[PDB]
């Protein structure tokens, strides 16, 4: 067998059947004779390729396979990899290298010192020392991406390797099973359970690795047993809990003092599947108030090490959530009361308040919709106003890097063809990965894109207000016609300048048979 | 003084007056109180920011200053940095970091292990250990970018540093002059000169560092004195010689065997300002044929080290070209004869041959036009058909990474407001950095963008033919309306489906007062 | 030809004829069939291997070739590489890697991520992608080490590569000449010369790259023409000037304020071949006083970039010193007066003051002796008391890393067989690389080792005094019998407990036919 044939066999035997890519010449020897049972999903720029693959991996809860062109293609994807690192996304990033015979001279398209390029944003990065090593290196990539804590990995392959003879002993790679589905030992788990059972006023905080593990339902049972309020850890990349369940208390503010004040009076705070904590703003004060202790369950040693407070347990989130939910006592405390409905904000016949937009989306979207957020000045309102009952219903760029939601929404929609995906993206954010729209058109992936257009980088104008910072340049983005951009890439486009038009546009979009972009005129901050 | 005030003083004292950026919160403390004497040029995605700055630096022959947002913003620019590395572009890339007090916890927007992120594509990469060090670190960045061999550098700055007190001793940084304008010692230079004077059939090969040094005219005098043919080194990022001068012989093929065959019978080949050589295709054979020896003058130790043949001298290209041109004897050999005019290719009233496009551009454009190339299936024809008399008239992505020409053409046009810039970009390539169009519209930078639209990644379809590679996915890019994309970003748009329409569109574009995009329907390969 | 044969041919054609090594199994395929015209110099630990090679390279002014065993052997040498980086030592460090077929599985002795191991202490670090690339990679290593600024480089070679067929085109590597012997262009050089000619009270500061370039005599002529005092830049790794010449003013103190005070009243300070400056102690104040400006000539862009003050010129030190010395006017100012003789310190019949030791060495050693210093509490006295008339007469660990002088003194003695080498090493320092003594014995390299034994880490006890730091552990090193260690490794050993015994021991040592160690009982601080 060739390296080519052996590698595609390994991929299929490990469950991979789709290549997300933007091709180049170093990749043609890999892509030729592309197997009939594989899909190729083309995107026009590599941030888009990786964002699509990332949404696909996160929603499918399985690794996604990417093929990029040498250093420049890898480099174009490096912002996308920063988000994938923070979301623990299992991405296998392959890039084509020059033929081994011209690497030395640094021919055009040589990826110099290739493994260092995507560092520090990958779990593992490698270029094999010979063609026959390529299948083994691919095996390592697959498992490194897939083992907890999941994350992106990088493999560079000289283009001449694919046609070489494979090692016959590579067949031992095909069916390897590797598990990190582990939980705390019985003795220590019993100690934890008894601490939870004994708490007088426990609280639970959940992060994105709960949703990645599909541990959401177990966390609902855990919260119901403990009679405990549930918050989402700050800067949330995913939604780990039904947002209308009576225990739900919303998104935590991303500040040190704000969080300790919120947790005051809770004697034990159990954090599951989150860093402790992904703060953002400067908000100095106590990490925890006297009387509160914290216990973190994380899949990631790096999270456990850097927490400034609390105990930690490094284990699989699915296995730990299941065990805890089934072992704790049913507390005789009263179940927490559901949060009240959000108020309706006054809305005239002009530009839309974001609150109006989210209320209308919640009114009209299916109960199994999936939302993406890249409209950060409106995040709080979004979290208050969308009833997200099911797992896998929310994605936000985990490293704060824009250009995620537009392509990721296409990958999520590909992963979940029966769940309507609705990406809510600011006018500023929409530009970073605008060319991803073309992939939705070409493959008829029916994502809905809602562009919140207020002409400015509103979150930055707001932060400049906070700093009392005058004379900051570069905060306004006038003069973008998003309907024309959508037309450019073959996506049906609608505009909503008022509420009547928003309702009508959403009705059409929800009925449409392909992707749709709606440009919404929103109020300026 | 504050670190902020001291740093802007250093920048202005070192000749920097423009910031190319896409802002974020870690950057607001740097950007506030933005000085009245500085410009800020906003672009909507960081590959665009860096491409604009790169074109500006290359055309201006001076460093350009960039400000990006943390890891994700840096990462989005990493493909652009791969080109900047290969073109020796003097780019000072700054990125904002989290406040020092939350770096440890890895708050959102912390750039983890920041200096390793842009490696291996930068000459120097650093994060200072204290606020008061920032001006000194900035000084190091400026000089590292600017010293030969020029190249991109990276500086990460925690946002809390800017308001801190500066060291009063930082004033010694402001007026430092650093020179690398050096040439070979007299004794060895005399040996070189006598070898050139004694050659029976010398040839000259020029690379991009000639154009960067504005050594073009000196190289013309050198070639005239030696009576020597002049070629451009392969994979050319710049044009180092007048393309209708009698000594000019064109772009070298990017192959080992092809180059040695071309140089056969030349006893001494003098290469100036190029790697030896930036080959591309696989074309094995002799590096040089018997009877040819090679001497390379390069500004870059890395180029001198990796050449597989020849002697080398590591020195400034401007200083060496001037010295050689003024020291060599006037040979009594006959001056080389100019290459013949290109033939006119037959053209019907339908889709345009690329040869027709280039001939029409050459017929209509001003003699001081500046061209950019990101239409690689047509590169040979472009080099044959455009008379480029002046320095700074041609740019092509130096690492082969697409997404360069569209933004770079805007930066070049900003650098050279009296020279009409015309970017010739394939339909595939146009997408990578499409959002850069917005910057041309907003600042009214009157670049002309000629989109060569044949619906496919033509160079890859061609290479797949060469490999006899069947069943390669992802090679076609149908369904993009470039006029609508231009309208999306506020740029006047025209279409040319035939020659009559091409002439009319170019006439309008050349008369226009702002940027113009022309979508040309070109023949499919 | 094989890769083995081609590589040894390249080495010999490039002037390399000696391998400094400590062997292992990954190296046996390289070392077998060792060529008859090469020497192998064995040392027992890799810090010793590299230190010997470093002294050899520095004294010979040419690259030295090293062969180490995989990661552990490389790692053992990493402190030695820190000194080599700071001294600009041209060292070609090769390390054997596992066979390509087991690199993937990470067999024992695989050097994982090999090129990153010696970073950041090497100029270039690489592992080739195929066996046939090895000669080209070796060529790159040779030139990268040898081009200005010189420094250590690293090449990892899988052991199976050596027996493979070489590329016949590798012959073009054998005779490549690469020059960085460059100086400032005429116009700017004339500006510099006129600034020196116009100075009212110039000063000159010289660093180690002067001695590396053998620019010492040119700097003497320059100083005589300018009538200028000459100092050695702080933390000096080499001696760049005759220490009894009338212009000589000694070693600068390694402090910011101390240096600006020393330079006060000098209008132009010309620094040649040094960083600006290798300060050490904390001594805050002005970098320069009003009225002093600084001009630096350096071979190293990194030095030019980081200087906190002054102009800089990046060029070859040999070429620049020669040009300046021959172009400046003869000033009509009076030549500086020689420094006075050092005083004799009172010495009783007991333990030796260091001043007594240095005076006795100066009284007894040949005029062409070469000294090494790893007795840092006595550095000032050493520099005052040894008349060093000739180039190449002094070495001190350039990064402050102990374990340099003992092995380096053996390499220097190998490089300079007719110049008696005398290493003056503290009792603490002597231990770091003690096993290097064996190489002197085995190869009968007749270095003299003078161990200054006061039982303590005296410089640290002193610095703890400065900090008023109480209760510092680990500062005393009692209970070492250096005569027994010398006997252990086959080196003749003598003891000197008083001056009579010091004179007698030096008389014997200077007459001896092999290496000699003298343990001197020195006064405790
Ligand atoms: C890749 C990238 N570049 C820049 C930013 C910085 N950034 C930017 C540019 C913001 C403004 C986004 O504007 P928008 O129109 O998308 O949304 P709002 O108006 O709701 O802020 S908020 C913020 O952090 C970023 N997060 N990611
Ligand atoms: C960033 C990036 N990604 C992918 C490629 C690979 N690439 C691609 C995608 C080519 C096709 C370009 O198509 P085009 O329409 O711009 O021009 P042609 O039709 O003339 O080939 S040629 C080539 O090397 C690249 N060079 N740079
Ligand atoms: C490799 C290494 N480790 C530790 C040190 C630290 N060090 C040490 C250990 C000193 C004491 C040296 O003692 P000595 O006996 O050699 O000389 P003195 O008594 O003259 O200080 S001074 C100093 O910087 C060092 N420079 N290099
Ligand atoms: Ca409602
Ligand atoms: Ca906005
Ligand atoms: Ca014509
Ligand atoms: Ca095309
Ligand atoms: Ca004396
Ligand atoms: Ca001591
Ligand atoms: Na990197
Ligand atoms: Na290292």
From Swiss-Prot, chains A, B, C:
Q: Does the keyword Protein transport apply?
A: no
Family membership: Belongs to the TPP enzyme family.
Cofactors required? Ca(2+); thiamine diphosphate; Mg(2+)
- Known catalysed reaction(s)? phenylglyoxylate + H(+) = benzaldehyde + CO2
The pathway to which it is assigned is: Aromatic compound metabolism; (R)-mandelate degradation; benzoate from (R)-mandelate: step 3/4
Say if the entry is tagged with keyword Calcium: yes
Q: What are the recorded GO MF terms, alphabetically?
A: acetolactate synthase activity; benzoylformate decarboxylase activity; flavin adenine dinucleotide binding; magnesium ion binding; thiamine pyrophosphate binding
Q: Which residues bind Mg(2+)?
A: 116-117, 119
Quaternary state and interactors = Homotetramer.
Residues of the region (Thiamine pyrophosphate binding) are 376-459
Q: How is the cofactor bound?
A: Binds 1 Ca(2+) ion per subunit. Binds 1 thiamine pyrophosphate per subunit.
One BP annotation, GO: mandelate catabolic process
Report the EC number(s), separated by commas if there are several. 4.1.1.7
Keywords (A to Z) from UniProt: Aromatic hydrocarbons catabolism, Calcium, Decarboxylase, Lyase, Magnesium, Mandelate pathway, Metal-binding, Thiamine pyrophosphate
Coiled-coil intervals in this record? Answer: none
The superkingdom of the source organism is: Bacteria
Recorded protein name is Benzoylformate decarboxylase
Residues that bind Ca(2+), according to the entry? 427, 454, 456
The uppermost taxa in this organism's lineage are: Bacteria, Pseudomonadati, Pseudomonadota, Gammaproteobacteria, Pseudomonadales
The family database entries (InterPro entries) matched by this protein are listed as:
DHS-like_NAD/FAD-binding_dom, THDP-binding, Thiamin_PyroP_enz_cen_dom, Thiamin_PyroP_enz_TPP-bd_dom, TPP-bd_CS, TPP_enz, TPP_enzyme_TPP-bd
